[PDB]
Paper text:
Cytoplasmic dynein is a large homodimer that consists of a heavy chain (>500 kDa) and several smaller associated subunits, each present in two copies. The heavy chain ‘tail’ domain binds the associated subunits, which include the intermediate chain (IC), the light intermediate chain (LIC), and the light chains (LC): Tctex1, LC8, and LC7/roadblock. The LIC subunits, which are present in all cytoplasmic dyneins described thus far but absent from axonemal dyneins, are thought to play important roles in cargo transport. Interestingly, the C-terminal half of the protein is involved in binding Rab effectors, whereas the G domain is the docking site for the dynein heavy chain.
In this study, we report the crystal structure of the conserved N-terminal domain of the LIC from a thermophilic hyphal fungus, [name], and show that it is composed of a canonical G protein fold. The LIC structure revealed a central β-sheet flanked by α-helices, which in comparison with other protein structures in the Protein Data Bank (PDB) using the Dali server, is most similar to the G domain of small GTP-binding proteins. Like Ras, the prototype of small G proteins, LIC has six β-strands in the core of the structure (five parallel and one anti-parallel) as well as five similarly placed α-helices. In addition to the five-α-helices found in Ras, the LIC G domain has two-α-helical insertions (α-helix 3a and 4a) that extend from the core of the structure. The LIC G domain also has three additional α-helices at the C-terminus (α-helix 6, 7, and 8) that interact with the core G domain structure and has a short seventh β-strand that extends the β-sheet. However, unlike most small GTP-binding proteins, the nucleotide pocket is empty, the P-loop exhibits a closed conformation and our biochemical experiments confirm that the fungal LIC G domain does not bind nucleotide. Unusual for G proteins, the ‘P-loop’ and ‘switch 2’ of the [name] LIC G domain interact with one another; the side chain of Q60 in the P-loop hydrogen bonds with the main chain carbonyl of G54 and the side chain of T116 in switch 2. When the [name] LIC G domain was injected onto a C18 column for reverse-phase liquid chromatography (RPLC) with acetonitrile, no 260 nm adsorbing molecule eluted from the column, which is consistent with the lack of nucleotide in the crystal structure. Relatively few universally conserved residues are on the surface of the LIC G domain, with the exception of a hydrophobic groove of universally conserved residues composed of three aromatic residues (Y93, Y95 [β2], and Y113 [β3]) and Leu125 (α2) (residue numbers refer to the position in [name] LIC). In contrast, the other five double or triple mutations tested bound normally to the dynein heavy chain. These results indicate that the universally conserved hydrophobic groove on the LIC is involved in binding to the dynein heavy chain.
Residue numbers in the entry: 44 to 73, 89 to 201, 211 to 345, 375 to 394
Write the structure that this text describes.
């Protein structure tokens, strides 16, 4: 009888998915995809607001991706969030991993019924203003034209990217010589491509409290009857990044550090996503730009 919400959880490992689940549901909780769920409590830890179902796909398999079809119906689509897990142990892999998941996901979404696609268009239209500072809160409850890059590439569903094990940033600083400005460049690259999908970005560390529950629950359209504090965005304190939807812009991305060609990187992401799924990297690719900038210690 509870409102039902879905998370489609992509990537990670067995342990990092479980860590995601704990981080997500710690405070405010009471041939197949992995499955679990939990009941979300309101901010006083009393009343139950929604039941969140999580469907998990660790690897970008086309076979198992097909299992998403039955989960995405006209009724479920407006209640669904895509979450991609990335790992701070291997940030050099991020842009390529992200491209693969998005191409995979697109393959599923174009295959849904006309009614599903009409519903996804409705969802995308309504997301334009959610949490944008005008009339509409991030959670979809009520209270200027779009900058460049913003929502140029709506997926049909909202996306949240969660970069796990951020304690490994300190590891890269001390054993691989990474400087503050290298973490910032990663951030500029991620913010730029994700902006095109209207997507959020958040870094987490196991056992370190974060805004992950508030971000995910608000993105799922779960409306607190007690709390009106909005999300707190951060792009400065490097291991606690929080970039909520409809907050970022090229203007903001460009000032983090100098020398970042935001438009080139945004156009390179068009090059990357205009490709069949599932050999060589196309001219202008942002995966290539990223992988030149963020090198693998091989």
């Amino acid at each position: 009888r509870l409102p039902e919400k879905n998370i489609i959880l992509l990537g990670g490992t067995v342990d990092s998915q479980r860590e995601f689940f704990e981080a997500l549901s710690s405070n405010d909780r009471r041939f197949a995809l992995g499955y679990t769920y939990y009941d979300v409590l309101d901010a006083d830890h009393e009343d139950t607001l929604a039941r969140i179902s999580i469907y998990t796909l660790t690897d970008p398999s086309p076979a198992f991706a097909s299992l998403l079809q039955p989960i995405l119906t006209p009724d479920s689509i407006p209640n669904t969030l895509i979450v991609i897990l990335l790992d701070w142990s291997q940030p050099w892999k991020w842009m390529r991993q992200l491209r693969e998941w998005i191409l995979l996901l697109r393959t599923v979404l174009v295959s849904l019924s006309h009614e599903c696609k009409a519903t996804m268009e409705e969802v995308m239209l309504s997301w334009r203003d959610r949490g944008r500072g005008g009339g509409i809160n991030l959670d979809g409850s009520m209270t200027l034209p779009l900058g460049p890059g913003e929502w140029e590439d709506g997926l049909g569903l909202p996306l949240c990217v969660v970069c796990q094990n951020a304690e490994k940033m300190e590891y890269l600083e001390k054993t691989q010589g990474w400087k503050e400005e290298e973490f910032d460049v990663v951030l500029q690259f991620m913010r730029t491509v994700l902006l095109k999908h209207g997507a959020s970005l958040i870094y987490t560390t196991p056992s370190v409290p974060s805004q992950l529950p508030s971000l995910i629950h608000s993105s799922l359209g779960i409306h607190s009857l007690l709390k009106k504090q909005p999300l707190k965005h951060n792009v400065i304190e490097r291991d606690k990044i929080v970039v909520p939807p409809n907050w970022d812009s090229w203007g903001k991305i460009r000032v983090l550090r100098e020398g970042f060609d935001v438009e080139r990187v945004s156009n390179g992401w068009s090059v990357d996503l205009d490709q069949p799924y599932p050999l060589p990297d196309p001219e202008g690719s942002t995966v290539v730009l990223y992988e030149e900038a963020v090198q693998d210690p091989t």
